[PDB]
Amino acid sequence: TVFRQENVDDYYDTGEELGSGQFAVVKKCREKSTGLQYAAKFIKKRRTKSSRRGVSREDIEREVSILKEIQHPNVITLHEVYENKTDVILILELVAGGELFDFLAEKSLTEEEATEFLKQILNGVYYLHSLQIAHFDLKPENIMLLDRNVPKPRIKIIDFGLAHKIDFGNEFKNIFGTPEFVAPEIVNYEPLGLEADMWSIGVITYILLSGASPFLGDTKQETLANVSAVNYEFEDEYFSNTSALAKDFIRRLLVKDPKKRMTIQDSLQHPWIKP
Ligand SMILES: O=C(/C=C/c1ccc(O)c(Br)c1)c1ccc(O)cc1O
Structure with missing residues (x-):
């Protein structure tokens, strides 16, 4: 074309x-x-x-x-x-x-502030996944606000440079995304589908609530090894006043087997999100 x-x-x-x-x-x-x-x-x-x-x-x-x-x-x-x-x-x-990432550096978010952003992310991903579009690059850098000077800013997902249509439920390609946010199937060069985005949302949610990245190592190989092994935990110093249900939402997204991970519809029905 x-x-x-x-x-x-x-x-x-x-x-x-x-x-x-x-x-x-x-x-x-x-x-x-x-x-x-x-x-x-x-x-x-x-x-x-x-x-x-x-x-x-x-x-x-x-x-x-x-x-x-x-x-x-x-x-x-x-x-x-x-x-x-x-x-x-x-x-x-x-x-x-500006970025959700840079807006994050200004302040961790309360659960209400986090869910207000997260609900908009979930609504955008629900639309994409409904069209069988995997984004494959969800991360704070790719989530930007229309106006950062309102109490509840409206967000937009940008950067469709890795996005793929998933007409057969999976695609077999390499996705060189950012180690801290890619799912284990990307790290392991496995077939990839909409589930990989749901893992990334789990990482984003962990960061929104705590200010800390769950798999980040000192080198990219360490980060990728941690992702594949699902080597993360909720540090009490960061999560001590975070609700158990918020932790439950994250735990059901940071699941190695893509078939057992929450889907986008599951995430919208989860009790932390569902109104
Ligand atoms: O910086 C980037 C994103 C920017 C942006 C800012 C405001 C907007 O309205 C829109 Br649309 C995009 C970026 C994107 C793709 C890439 O391959 C490398 C990059 O650095």
Whole structure:
């Protein structure tokens, strides 16, 4: 699939940089014809077949095709796609309130503050999983707020760069996600499905309530070894006033066997969440 090949700078002006990764940079932008503001994600293309730099066209097209399907209050919306010889440029909904990660560093959350965020995450993941879309990269960095100066900020899931459609209940690919948040089946190079996202939500919930990462080691290999062995515990120093039911929710997500892990529907019916 080909994208718009006119120069993006003829239709948008860019501003503040919003974020920067190995193969992409995101810049605030403004559409000249409407004054409306967006986030432009510039993805570096691969320059040869065998190269390891840049993102393969297959991977870029997969992300675009997923973004084109989704429309939900808790997921980013895609506006337009441009390309040139160097980059594919996704014009995405602007989410300007900052990361859940950075907002976390400002303060641990109470269970009410945590569940208010978590319920929005669960609602977005429920929508995705309903469409058989696995995100495969859920982590505080990919959860951003629309406005961080309200008592109950609204969140959006960003970054569909690892997301896959799961038409057969599992996909057999490598997911090089972030060690602290990937499920044991990713660490072990196993077939992957929607369950991997539910493990990541369990990790996110642990961090939201405690300020601490449950599997984090001193090196990436230690973190990955801890994930595979399900080597975590609730430290009393961090969890002593956290309810048992919040711990129960986490414990039913941080389950090695994906078949025994809570699904997204289970998580919404769990007594800690269900109203
Ligand atoms: O920084 C990133 C996310 C940014 C963002 C900020 C505000 C937004 O509205 C939107 Br959409 C995205 C990022 C994304 C992908 C990647 O491969 C590397 C990255 O660093």
